[PDB]
Design a protein around this ligand. Structure first.
Ligand SMILES: Cc1cc2nc3c(=O)[nH]c(=O)nc-3n(C[C@H](O)[C@H](O)[C@H](O)COP(=O)(O)O)c2cc1C
Ligand SMILES: NC(=O)c1cccnc1
Ligand SMILES: [K+]
Ligand code: NA
Length: 355
């Protein structure tokens, strides 16, 4: 397959195999309501086969990123309409990334204590509405709270359809809530959601089954990050836990699995925990979309091997609205301005020229 060849996935055909990775940009409101400028931003990049949205909070409890959007309220759904409309006018497809940040939710943002599989304090400093602050002490989510959490995911997934998204991708990477349950450095639970591999993927499983029951498998995607430590989340033997995860996901027949894979020389994830896509390819039958550090040449190499069906691009899409065109034209890629990744205005957001 050619990077430029269409791909069938779920209920859809993407126009190409050059996809937009989920990118948190912070151009929504303090109260996590999307804004008009986000529509232009996404429209510019509609040549992406699929745009995966920036991470979108499923509830205030799960949303701790300042000026990131949520999707739990009616006013949020309404504000998303112009964004999805724009994408579909430009002929493109967009999935919503559904986001529970777990232990990484700053109380300055959510207003409450963050929840996690297990009690702990995330290392580091979180972005807030008054500067960086260190993270709070999370509480271990009670077994009797999992029914609620699932309803939070259900509401969010239906709200995504109302907002005009083609479907959802469940954020289960990068050290946020689901990924904390999966990995043995963060999951120290004694009940049916911790200890054994099947217990550790149990939240992933039930949240996936609840989304599938709400909006159909053909609109339901998952993100994982099985290799390399991130935000104090790592597993001691990731092959033991992520391969069974990938097989459980494949049996549900989700629309695609996206994964960000760290590398020894990785620039958004550095690690010698090796990449598990080769082993995950063998158990995961639906489309497998690989990410992190791909060039045009390495992305097509991955397609040529069959290990990837598509590749998402992150920072390249930030400064290169029309990446696919720049690829085939052999046009230099504009470099993204790191300082403006997460500021609040149009500068370094919608002001990168197209070709
Ligand atoms: C500014 C920025 C924002 C990001 N936001 C998200 C996000 O909302 N959800 C997510 O899963 N990953 C996010 N990521 C990780 C990226 O999707 C991607 O995995 C990373 O950019 C590596 O891919 P690349 O080398 O193609 O850029 C983000 C990365 C960057 C640099
Ligand atoms: N999921 C992620 O890794 C991420 C990174 C930065 C901002 N938002 C989300
Ligand atoms: K941080
Ligand atoms: Na639309």
């Amino acid at each position: 397959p050619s990077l430029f060849d269409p791909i069938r996935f779920g209920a859809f055909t993407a126009k190409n195999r050059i996809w937009m990775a989920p990118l948190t940009r912070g151009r929504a409101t303090r109260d996590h309501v999307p804004t008009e400028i986000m529509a232009e931003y996404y429209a510019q990049r509609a040549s992406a086969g699929l745009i995966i949205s920036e991470a979108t909070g499923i509830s205030q409890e799960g949303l701790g990123w300042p000026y990131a959007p949520g999707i739990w309220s009616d006013a949020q759904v309404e504000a998303w309409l112009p964004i999805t409309q724009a994408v579909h006018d430009a002929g493109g497809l967009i999935f919503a990334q559904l986001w529970h940040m777990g232990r990484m939710v700053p109380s300055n943002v959510s207003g409450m204590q963050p929840v996690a599989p297990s009690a702990s304090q995330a290392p580091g400093l979180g972005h807030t509405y008054d500067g960086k602050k260190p993270y709070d002490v999370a509480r271990a989510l009670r077994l009797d709270e999992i029914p609620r959490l699932l309803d939070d995911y259900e509401k969010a997934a239906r709200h995504a359809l109302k907002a005009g998204f083609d479907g959802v991708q469940i954020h289960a990477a990068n050290g946020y809530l689901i990924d904390e349950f999966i990995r043995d450095s963060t999951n120290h639970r004694h009940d049916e959601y911790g200890g054994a591999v099947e217990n550790r993927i149990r939240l992933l499983k039930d949240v996936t089954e609840r989304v599938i029951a709400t909006i159909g498998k053909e609109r339901t995607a998952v993100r994982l990050s099985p290799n390399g430590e991130i935000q104090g989340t790592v597993d001691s033997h990731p092959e033991q836990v992520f391969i069974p995860a990938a097989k459980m996901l494949s049996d549900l027949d989700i629309a695609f699995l996206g994964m960000r894979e760290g590398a020894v020389d990785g620039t958004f994830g550095k690690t010698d925990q090796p990449k598990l896509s080769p082993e995950i390819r063998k158990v995961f039958k639906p489309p497998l979309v690989l990410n992190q550090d791909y060039t045009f040449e390495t992305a097509q190499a991955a397609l040529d091997s069959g290990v990837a069906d598509a590749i998402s691009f992150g920072r390249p899409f930030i400064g290169n609205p029309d990446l696919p065109r720049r690829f085939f034209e052999k046009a230099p890629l504009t470099k993204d301005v790191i300082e403006t990744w997460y500021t609040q205005t149009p500068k370094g957001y919608t002001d990168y020229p197209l070709l």
